[PDB]
Design a binder for this molecule. Sequence first.
Ligand SMILES: CC(C)=CCC/C(C)=C/CC/C(C)=C/CC/C(C)=C/CC/C(C)=C/CC/C(C)=C/CC/C(C)=C/CC/C(C)=C/CC/C(C)=C/CC1=C(C)C(=O)c2ccccc2C1=O
Ligand SMILES: CCCCCCCCCCCCCCCC(=O)O[C@H](COC(=O)CCCCCCC[C@@H](C)CCCCCCCCC)COP(=O)(O)O[C@H]1[C@H](O)[C@H](O)[C@H](O)[C@@H](O)[C@@H]1O
Ligand code: HEC
Ligand code: HEC
Ligand SMILES: CCCCCCCCCCCCCCCC(=O)OC[C@H](C)OC(=O)CCCCCCCC[C@@H](C)CCCCCCCC
Ligand SMILES: *C(=O)CCCCCCCCCCCCCCC
Lengths: 158, 223, 54
Amino acid sequence: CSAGQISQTTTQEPAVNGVNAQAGQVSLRNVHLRAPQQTDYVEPGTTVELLFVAANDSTESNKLKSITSDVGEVTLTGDSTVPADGVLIVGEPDGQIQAVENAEAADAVTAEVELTKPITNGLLYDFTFTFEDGETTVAVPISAGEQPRRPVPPAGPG
Amino acid sequence: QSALLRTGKQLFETSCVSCHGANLQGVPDRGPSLIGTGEAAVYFQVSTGRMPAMRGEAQAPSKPPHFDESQIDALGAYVQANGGGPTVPRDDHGAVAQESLIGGDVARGGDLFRLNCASCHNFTGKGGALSSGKYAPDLGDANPAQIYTAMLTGPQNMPKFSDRQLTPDEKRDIVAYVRESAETPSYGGYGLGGFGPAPEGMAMWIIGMVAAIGVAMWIGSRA
Amino acid sequence: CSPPGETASSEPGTTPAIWTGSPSPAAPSGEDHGGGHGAGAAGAGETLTAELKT
Ligand SMILES: CC(C)=CCC/C(C)=C/CC/C(C)=C/CC/C(C)=C/CC/C(C)=C/CC/C(C)=C/CC/C(C)=C/CC/C(C)=C/CC/C(C)=C/CC1=C(C)C(=O)c2ccccc2C1=O
Ligand SMILES: CCCCCCCCCCCCCCCC(=O)O[C@H](COC(=O)CCCCCCC[C@@H](C)CCCCCCCCC)COP(=O)(O)O[C@H]1[C@H](O)[C@H](O)[C@H](O)[C@@H](O)[C@@H]1O
Ligand code: HEC
Ligand code: HEC
Ligand SMILES: CCCCCCCCCCCCCCCC(=O)OC[C@H](C)OC(=O)CCCCCCCC[C@@H](C)CCCCCCCC
Ligand SMILES: *C(=O)CCCCCCCCCCCCCCC
């Protein structure tokens, strides 16, 4: 009776770095920050990108995506009202394929944030995604999409 | 590719939208969202066959694949385009790499396997048990691409080994060790499975002890 | 019995500060040499860089 109403397989989040925020009609999937850090912190004043996918649940739509801004002044370049029983893919997560030579509306709604606050990988930073339906804090992580190991200096025994 | 994306979408729409809802978002309490899982996850999971899954239980078992390599690639490309994420390795031609994933070093691969893989699988990649109905399966069926993608995307209750955590060279070494341990003949006779104490004790008690008792019954006299 | 100290739900906590390791004291006093030089002054050593900007 591992197959009962509470089963391990069904109640599993995706094995992805981005968090999931189902609150609100539009569901946020694989929401993370591309913020390549060269040191302990990503210093304020540097622009890091905000990846996620906004999937519409209802066909009756919530395609506004008004502000979705928090501490950092997230700006949505090439903003569009995409979600209509479909996906709004704000950016290009590492490994993303354009899927066609051309493109629609230039960039596909790329969200970029001027930090105004140090951030580091491993921490969770709250972002308030607000559609016309409602607002939800998501606690976005920092994800190193596909970058390999940065060479750490060799150690001199002492 | 356009036609590859279209084929992946058509397969997805008539295979999994009931549990990975259309738009790749997950159906609450039936399946996780596939945004960000990537092409490697799709390749491993569908090729091992786990994904045409017909039950929600402790663990999704392996099974014959429901799609051929071309359809696996179509589904993987569709999922990668929708979400974007890790990609399965490929060789010079374009096919999923099998021999290229055999790392040169096998001692290093074995050390890494013992530190990370044997934790649950086995000393030599036989299966292992887990908490509640789960289990780490035997690795002898997995091919190098399947092992590499299993590490790349933690399939289920398995830690997700990123390239940063296990550089592709380390993963190639682990793949080499897995294949070598799986394809290596047991020196010293029939390795009874791969577990020493339990299969060895059963074989003692059944083969050696029944032989000894039967010989004793032959020599002696019932009374 | 159960372990005396467990289950502190309250006090959510705070993010650890950036570690600032102290230099090894006389115990592990060994340290890398910063550069040997005559140093006929307060001391500069055998290491000195500079950036000429515009
Ligand atoms: C703590 C504890 C014992 C918990 C319960 C776990 C347990 C032993 C459960 C039973 C295992 C079984 C019998 C599973 C099949 C499903 C099941 C329960 C069916 C109903 C049982 C039933 C009433 C059937 C009708 C008649 C009946 C009693 C049939 C029993 C059938 C069997 C399996 C008989 C032989 C007993 C047997 C092999 C038990 C497993 C125990 C061990 C330690 C096997 C060792 C062993 C292993 C594990 C290898 O992998 C191996 C690989 C290569 C070479 C050799 C071996 C080897 O010897
Ligand atoms: C009486 C004295 C005689 C003793 C038996 C001696 C037999 C000698 C055999 C010949 C020489 C040694 C061959 C060694 C080559 C070799 O090892 O043999 C394997 C086979 O293995 C199996 O499957 C088992 C096949 C079934 C036949 C053997 C069964 C004998 C058992 C019953 C004896 C013990 C008694 C226990 C009693 C049980 C009842 C208790 C109530 C075959 O390869 P494979 O099958 O592919 O192994 C997989 C890797 O590949 C793959 O990666 C790996 O991942 C694995 O999957 C691995 O299995
Ligand atoms: C218990 C933690 C865990 C560790 C750590 C782990 N595995 Fe796994 N592994 C599993 C589980 C559980 C599965 C089954 C996943 C599924 O069926 O969806 C699995 C699946 C696999 C498979 C698929 C085999 C098949 O035929 O489907 C291979 C190959 C594999 N692991 C090898 C590895 C490698 C290589 C590593 C690198 C160290 C590793 N394991 C580390 C638990 C683990
Ligand atoms: C409920 C039946 C079921 C169907 C049918 C199904 N999936 Fe899934 N899927 C799941 C479950 C449950 C998980 C997570 C647990 C697991 O994988 O065992 C999952 C996870 C996945 C993963 C891995 C996610 C990760 O984070 O590693 C991929 C890739 C995937 N599904 C793709 C597919 C594809 C492609 C198909 C159709 C070819 C499909 N699934 C069909 C239920 C299903
Ligand atoms: C006192 C000893 C005698 C028994 C006394 C009366 C014993 C009376 C036993 C009532 C049992 C009531 C169970 C209530 C279920 C529950 O609420 O929990 C749900 C749980 C989550 O579901 C499960 O996980 C599995 C549940 C199914 C059990 C399959 C057992 C099959 C047995 C076979 C393996 C054959 C064994 C051979 C057995 C051979 C015996 C044949 C009779
Ligand atoms: C998951 O591991 C099993 C799910 C099965 C749940 C329903 C069980 C029905 C009852 C079976 C009766 C068994 C025999 C009773 C002996 C007295």
